[PDB]
Amino acid sequence: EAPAAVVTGAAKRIGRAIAVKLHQTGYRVVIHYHNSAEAAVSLADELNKERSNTAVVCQADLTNSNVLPASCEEIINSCFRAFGRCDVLVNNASAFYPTPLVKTVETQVAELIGTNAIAPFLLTMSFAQRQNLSIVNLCDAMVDQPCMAFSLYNMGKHALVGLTQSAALELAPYGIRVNGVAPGVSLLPVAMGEEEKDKWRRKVPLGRREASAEQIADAVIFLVSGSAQYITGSIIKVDGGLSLVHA
Amino acid sequence: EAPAAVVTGAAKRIGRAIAVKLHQTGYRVVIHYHNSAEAAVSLADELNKERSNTAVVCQADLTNSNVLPASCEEIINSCFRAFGRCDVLVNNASAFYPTPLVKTVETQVAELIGTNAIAPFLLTMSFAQRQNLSIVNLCDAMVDQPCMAFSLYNMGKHALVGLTQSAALELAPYGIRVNGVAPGVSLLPVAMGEEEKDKWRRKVPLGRREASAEQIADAVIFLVSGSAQYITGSIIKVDGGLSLVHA
Amino acid sequence: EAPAAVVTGAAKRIGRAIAVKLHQTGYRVVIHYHNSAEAAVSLADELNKERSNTAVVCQADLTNSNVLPASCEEIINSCFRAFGRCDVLVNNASAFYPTPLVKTVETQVAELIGTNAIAPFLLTMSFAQRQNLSIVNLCDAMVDQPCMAFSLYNMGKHALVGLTQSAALELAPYGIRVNGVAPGRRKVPLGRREASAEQIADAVIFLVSGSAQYITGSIIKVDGGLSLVHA
Amino acid sequence: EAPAAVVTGAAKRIGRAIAVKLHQTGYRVVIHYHNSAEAAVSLADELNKERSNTAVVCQADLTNSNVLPASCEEIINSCFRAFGRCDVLVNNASAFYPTPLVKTVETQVAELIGTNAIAPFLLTMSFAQRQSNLSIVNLCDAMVDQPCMAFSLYNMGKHALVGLTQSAALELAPYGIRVNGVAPGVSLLPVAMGEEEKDKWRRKVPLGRREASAEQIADAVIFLVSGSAQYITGSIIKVDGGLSLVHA
Ligand SMILES: NC(=O)c1ccc[n+]([C@@H]2O[C@H](COP(=O)([O-])OP(=O)(O)OC[C@H]3O[C@@H](n4cnc5c(N)ncnc54)[C@H](OP(=O)(O)O)[C@@H]3O)[C@@H](O)[C@H]2O)c1
Ligand SMILES: NC(=O)c1ccc[n+]([C@@H]2O[C@H](COP(=O)([O-])OP(=O)(O)OC[C@H]3O[C@@H](n4cnc5c(N)ncnc54)[C@H](OP(=O)(O)O)[C@@H]3O)[C@@H](O)[C@H]2O)c1
Ligand SMILES: NC(=O)c1ccc[n+]([C@@H]2O[C@H](COP(=O)([O-])OP(=O)(O)OC[C@H]3O[C@@H](n4cnc5c(N)ncnc54)[C@H](OP(=O)(O)O)[C@@H]3O)[C@@H](O)[C@H]2O)c1
Ligand SMILES: NC(=O)c1ccc[n+]([C@@H]2O[C@H](COP(=O)([O-])OP(=O)(O)OC[C@H]3O[C@@H](n4cnc5c(N)ncnc54)[C@H](OP(=O)(O)O)[C@@H]3O)[C@@H](O)[C@H]2O)c1
Ligand SMILES: CCN(Cc1cnc2nc(N)nc(N)c2n1)c1ccc(C(=O)N2CCC(C(=O)OC)CC2)cc1
Ligand SMILES: CCN(Cc1cnc2nc(N)nc(N)c2n1)c1ccc(C(=O)N2CCC(C(=O)OC)CC2)cc1
Ligand SMILES: CCN(Cc1cnc2nc(N)nc(N)c2n1)c1ccc(C(=O)N2CCC(C(=O)OC)CC2)cc1
């Protein structure tokens, strides 16, 4: 039968493009979402119009809490419930906002570290326990040149590098590859003004523009494919050279 | 007036050696501890015998929880109440145990991520808000070749790298330097069989032995000294070459 | 119509697999060789039997010397002469042997540093000067956990990382991407699967493709996880 | 007996600061130089005035060539000839200039790769062969992974130096020889650089918006050669004021 994939935070933007490209490649998809119900349902409808019974939505908050393990188990279970298998997990969902050193701080910890690291970890556990299997984590090419006042976000993304490597090592004997894709400047925030978007675009050596969502998705497609079957623990930057540019 | 330092997890082993060396260098010290009250008090009494009114203890659990921010604020406050200033923070305390992918898992997250990452972040916040100022984080030289089945621990230590770098950037305008010291094999568990300890020792190129706690402390002393005044965001491996050895 | 690629050290092993996959993808290829003329020509014969006049060979010593810049210019020129264009350069040729700290040492420098770093640099210059363009450098997944007594080899592979990054930055305004593929059994995490030259070639094919159009300065490890395994 | 150190490119700037601080710490020093004879002799004179017979000069070109191994052997031999021992080697000397991808190029290779990588390698060989607190410190570059535009050969050389530092740390560990690096970001700007251009670089540095002094770089070298670094080998300490953490 057709393989199946879970994509977190798949209603919009990069996650949406990943889900679309996996579906185009022949995967059945679980479209996870948190608040964006209308967009998730609209995407599932579009994919099911192309091939019936190949897309479902699954709602969950990925903030850390004592119920997060159950929520993550339920996302994986939702893929088995719909499709009878779960071949690929893409950890894409992510909270992102500044947390200056100088919502409560514990809520910020729960959101930023939960979505970017703890939920990927718990999803990884549940994915492995429930079993070309692979996991792709959406990292950040700027993790070692971080944005000012984004400590908790950056901590979460560093933790995700650690998970990628640790899980690659530990899950290799189960035939599960674990890799990352690290955007630099990709889709800018909807709320960001044009001037500020252009400041970011002008930093990029290759073309002075952000990555499209489809360009990020292309790297995910490579990593889950048969053409990457000896690749595990690798993080592919898709950053147009941004990370190589000094201050 | 003598400077003052907070050392977390200072009752035993590496933290104890760091507290002793800072004291020998002329610092007054807050000896933070969790369970090791007798050893913390013994150390304080030894240091106060050497010079009166130069050491106090401060008990706190550094597991993540709703109350962790207040606990971390209180640790920094204890230094100001005892000594009128807080010049140095050493984030040494750390939980360390395996968490296989295949205590509840959320307790393990709270302990491993809390001690290794969130508490350092909150302590950093409190240290900075309350202001040769510097912070030293105890990292891990093997963070990119992790031990099998230690994913949460490894995630925590990766997050600590991210904190070290983010905080170095953000706190530089306030004159606060933020660095790390990354042991490889240092003090092994007393209960570990010598035959297992020897397997670790023989991996180390430089002398086929573990680092003493004092050798780790020496790097901390350098980083807080005037001889490191331009150094921020650096993580110094103290590993005898271990991290350079392939499988 | 068809794009063209230069692959150094293409007669055998990884370079051969790369040349074959590029050719199967629709590239015309220059098969560079130093000593392996028979094997280079045998490969060209195989590829030309599939599509006439789509593979040529080019001899060059990639050891550093006074004549290396001209030799590297000729490799690139051979692609333009045969095919009228040069879209892809794969810096695959490599020398590999120990050089203990405790052939003359300067011959070892010329071979190890010259083949592994200087020739890639000179080829990069000549490729860029003559202009979906890209360069792929064959790196080492274990560059920061080096083999004992391989100092000069390791130094050259480090230099190649620096070239990859420097050239990605400098050549971005010309639309030339520059990336790397870093190859690495009971110790290999993915050791259930045998390592193959084809797996390395698959990563090269990805990097030269339109599916990697935003990727530059990236080095993809294809090592079964080996670089993650501690001592 | 006082230990002895070789510092390459020690007539001026960071190399002189390292030689001075090693001498202040009690080392006898070989001040290697290439073209800066007056400055090298002036320094040796100052150091010998402080303590007689504790400094000598040694001239050598560190460009790669078929004689470079003999030259490097001779630099180490000069330390033994003067002082009867050689405890520390500091690889500081460095050619630095752009080599755009779009002097002959082979001369540029010989100079940039010779000074920054091959000479350190040969000096490391000779130091180990001629043999307690023995160590080597290589002067690296904190910006090695965010390189300056049009500096590919220089950057290749500095990358190679990282590889040497790591390879030599592993291989020489059994002999009790530690091998480490110090990686400046912005330290002393070129003498010929205009003030406005210097300020462009200074303004990038998070910690103080200023370059590292030569002494600040030397402080890290002194730590690495000291007993306080006895378990440290294969480490490269950035001394960069946070520069390498700053995004585009
Ligand atoms: N865009 C870039 O330039 C860029 C740069 C570097 C790295 N990345 C990484 O690439 C990935 C995709 O980036 P993006 O910009 O497309 O992401 P995004 O739009 O900021 O976030 C993706 C989705 O994450 C979900 N999410 C946020 N908080 C959540 C929570 N508490 N629980 C569950 N889901 C939650 C949201 O789902 P709902 O909308 O359904 O609520 C959101 O649509 C992220 O991991 C990001 O860190 C992106
Ligand atoms: N030893 C090594 O070989 C090695 C290797 C790599 C890195 N490191 C790092 O170097 C540092 C020191 O290592 P070590 O071996 O000396 O550490 P350790 O003995 O394992 O732990 C140090 C102290 O951490 C405190 N701690 C643990 N859980 C805590 C909690 N929930 N709340 C508050 N404090 C807690 C404990 O204090 P109480 O005893 O008072 O309860 C303990 O004594 C650590 O950061 C470690 O990760 C060490
Ligand atoms: N094999 C591995 O496991 C591995 C691991 C890490 C990295 N790599 C890298 O992957 C690439 C290919 O590996 P490989 O094992 O296939 O390489 P290889 O067979 O060791 O060498 C490939 C070719 O390089 C050419 N070559 C060697 N010295 C030369 C010189 N002085 N001038 C010109 N050409 C010269 C030879 O061509 P002729 O035969 O025509 O003379 C040789 O066939 C290399 O860059 C290597 O460093 C491989
Ligand atoms: N300054 C910075 O901001 C900075 C930044 C990053 C890294 N670093 C590194 O730190 C070290 C010291 O920097 P610096 O600015 O003080 O260096 P520098 O002044 O540029 O050069 C130091 C010395 O190198 C010697 N040298 C150059 N070419 C030579 C050759 N062919 N043979 C022998 N010696 C040669 C010169 O000796 P003579 O004068 O006797 O001819 C020169 O005085 C260098 O390794 C450098 O790459 C410095
Ligand atoms: C170049 C990278 N990028 C694009 C971007 C856009 N969306 C993103 N989403 C997630 N989850 N993760 C990311 N890394 C991400 N990145 C960026 C980089 C920086 C910014 C920025 O300055 N701010 C500041 C104010 C915003 C806010 O919510 O304040 C409450 C947070 C965003 C915005 C976007
Ligand atoms: C070589 C590094 N090292 C020494 C060590 C010893 N203590 C440590 N403490 C902290 N907080 N962090 C560390 N990295 C650390 N490391 C090691 C390395 C590995 C081990 C090990 O096999 N186990 C398995 C069983 C142990 C247990 O019973 O719980 C305490 C958990 C640790 C023990 C010590
Ligand atoms: C911020 C680091 N820095 C200071 C500096 C100053 N001197 C240095 N010397 C050596 N050997 N190595 C270094 N890395 C070094 N760095 C820099 C960084 C960049 C530059 C620069 O734009 N140029 C361009 C013009 C110069 C020239 O054409 O000489 C012929 C080459 C150097 C100058 C100095």
PDB file of C-alpha atoms in Angstrom, chain B residues 205-206 236-244, chain C residues 101-102 146 151 154-155, chain D residues 87-91 117 120-125 127-128 131 133-140 160-182 220-221 223-226 229-237:
ATOM      1  CA  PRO B 205      44.471  10.177  24.584  1.00  0.00           C
ATOM      2  CA  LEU B 206      46.159  12.405  27.147  1.00  0.00           C
ATOM      3  CA  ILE B 236      36.554  25.318  26.504  1.00  0.00           C
ATOM      4  CA  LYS B 237      36.846  21.536  26.256  1.00  0.00           C
ATOM      5  CA  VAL B 238      38.791  20.003  29.143  1.00  0.00           C
ATOM      6  CA  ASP B 239      38.776  16.486  27.771  1.00  0.00           C
ATOM      7  CA  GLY B 240      42.284  15.172  27.187  1.00  0.00           C
ATOM      8  CA  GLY B 241      41.465  14.851  23.486  1.00  0.00           C
ATOM      9  CA  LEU B 242      38.553  12.458  24.023  1.00  0.00           C
ATOM     10  CA  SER B 243      36.190  14.277  21.619  1.00  0.00           C
ATOM     11  CA  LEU B 244      38.706  13.884  18.788  1.00  0.00           C
TER      12      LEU B 244
ATOM     13  CA  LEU C 101      54.459  13.324  12.843  1.00  0.00           C
ATOM     14  CA  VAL C 102      57.094  11.184  14.608  1.00  0.00           C
ATOM     15  CA  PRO C 146      40.710  12.171  12.313  1.00  0.00           C
ATOM     16  CA  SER C 151      47.753  14.857   9.666  1.00  0.00           C
ATOM     17  CA  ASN C 154      43.192  15.682   7.435  1.00  0.00           C
ATOM     18  CA  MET C 155      44.653  19.132   6.869  1.00  0.00           C
TER      19      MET C 155
ATOM     20  CA  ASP D  87      59.142  23.334  25.838  1.00  0.00           C
ATOM     21  CA  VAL D  88      56.646  25.425  23.903  1.00  0.00           C
ATOM     22  CA  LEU D  89      56.004  26.182  20.238  1.00  0.00           C
ATOM     23  CA  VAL D  90      53.638  29.001  19.252  1.00  0.00           C
ATOM     24  CA  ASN D  91      52.676  29.013  15.587  1.00  0.00           C
ATOM     25  CA  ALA D 117      49.475  25.396   7.719  1.00  0.00           C
ATOM     26  CA  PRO D 120      53.086  24.748  11.557  1.00  0.00           C
ATOM     27  CA  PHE D 121      52.987  21.088  10.503  1.00  0.00           C
ATOM     28  CA  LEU D 122      56.744  20.863   9.890  1.00  0.00           C
ATOM     29  CA  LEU D 123      57.546  22.800  13.066  1.00  0.00           C
ATOM     30  CA  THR D 124      55.265  20.413  14.966  1.00  0.00           C
ATOM     31  CA  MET D 125      57.133  17.454  13.455  1.00  0.00           C
ATOM     32  CA  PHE D 127      59.381  19.932  17.873  1.00  0.00           C
ATOM     33  CA  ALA D 128      58.180  16.404  18.608  1.00  0.00           C
ATOM     34  CA  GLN D 131      62.169  15.731  22.328  1.00  0.00           C
ATOM     35  CA  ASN D 133      54.933  20.588  30.460  1.00  0.00           C
ATOM     36  CA  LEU D 134      55.359  20.474  26.670  1.00  0.00           C
ATOM     37  CA  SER D 135      52.810  22.109  24.406  1.00  0.00           C
ATOM     38  CA  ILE D 136      52.088  23.749  21.090  1.00  0.00           C
ATOM     39  CA  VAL D 137      49.652  26.660  20.543  1.00  0.00           C
ATOM     40  CA  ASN D 138      48.405  27.473  17.077  1.00  0.00           C
ATOM     41  CA  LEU D 139      47.029  30.923  16.249  1.00  0.00           C
ATOM     42  CA  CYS D 140      43.725  30.149  14.511  1.00  0.00           C
ATOM     43  CA  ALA D 160      44.020  23.259   7.638  1.00  0.00           C
ATOM     44  CA  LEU D 161      45.499  24.647  10.861  1.00  0.00           C
ATOM     45  CA  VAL D 162      42.402  23.532  12.771  1.00  0.00           C
ATOM     46  CA  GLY D 163      42.895  20.069  11.305  1.00  0.00           C
ATOM     47  CA  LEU D 164      46.569  20.077  12.321  1.00  0.00           C
ATOM     48  CA  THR D 165      45.705  21.193  15.844  1.00  0.00           C
ATOM     49  CA  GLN D 166      43.291  18.282  16.235  1.00  0.00           C
ATOM     50  CA  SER D 167      45.393  15.654  14.440  1.00  0.00           C
ATOM     51  CA  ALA D 168      48.551  16.596  16.314  1.00  0.00           C
ATOM     52  CA  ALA D 169      46.705  16.671  19.655  1.00  0.00           C
ATOM     53  CA  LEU D 170      45.689  13.051  19.113  1.00  0.00           C
ATOM     54  CA  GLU D 171      48.981  11.811  17.774  1.00  0.00           C
ATOM     55  CA  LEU D 172      51.253  13.615  20.239  1.00  0.00           C
ATOM     56  CA  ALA D 173      49.142  12.925  23.379  1.00  0.00           C
ATOM     57  CA  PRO D 174      51.135   9.718  24.122  1.00  0.00           C
ATOM     58  CA  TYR D 175      54.327  11.850  24.241  1.00  0.00           C
ATOM     59  CA  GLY D 176      52.804  14.290  26.749  1.00  0.00           C
ATOM     60  CA  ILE D 177      52.714  17.070  24.164  1.00  0.00           C
ATOM     61  CA  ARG D 178      49.467  19.071  24.255  1.00  0.00           C
ATOM     62  CA  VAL D 179      48.334  20.905  21.124  1.00  0.00           C
ATOM     63  CA  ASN D 180      45.758  23.717  21.315  1.00  0.00           C
ATOM     64  CA  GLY D 181      44.641  26.845  19.541  1.00  0.00           C
ATOM     65  CA  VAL D 182      43.780  30.456  20.215  1.00  0.00           C
ATOM     66  CA  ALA D 220      44.886  32.835  26.314  1.00  0.00           C
ATOM     67  CA  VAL D 221      48.182  31.435  24.995  1.00  0.00           C
ATOM     68  CA  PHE D 223      46.742  29.846  29.991  1.00  0.00           C
ATOM     69  CA  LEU D 224      47.085  27.028  27.471  1.00  0.00           C
ATOM     70  CA  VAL D 225      50.824  26.551  28.099  1.00  0.00           C
ATOM     71  CA  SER D 226      50.320  26.663  31.881  1.00  0.00           C
ATOM     72  CA  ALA D 229      45.591  23.606  31.258  1.00  0.00           C
ATOM     73  CA  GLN D 230      47.315  20.255  31.853  1.00  0.00           C
ATOM     74  CA  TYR D 231      44.302  18.188  30.766  1.00  0.00           C
ATOM     75  CA  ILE D 232      43.476  20.431  27.786  1.00  0.00           C
ATOM     76  CA  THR D 233      44.506  19.200  24.357  1.00  0.00           C
ATOM     77  CA  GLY D 234      42.857  19.690  20.978  1.00  0.00           C
ATOM     78  CA  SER D 235      40.935  22.725  22.196  1.00  0.00           C
ATOM     79  CA  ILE D 236      40.638  25.997  20.302  1.00  0.00           C
ATOM     80  CA  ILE D 237      39.731  28.930  22.521  1.00  0.00           C
TER      81      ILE D 237
END
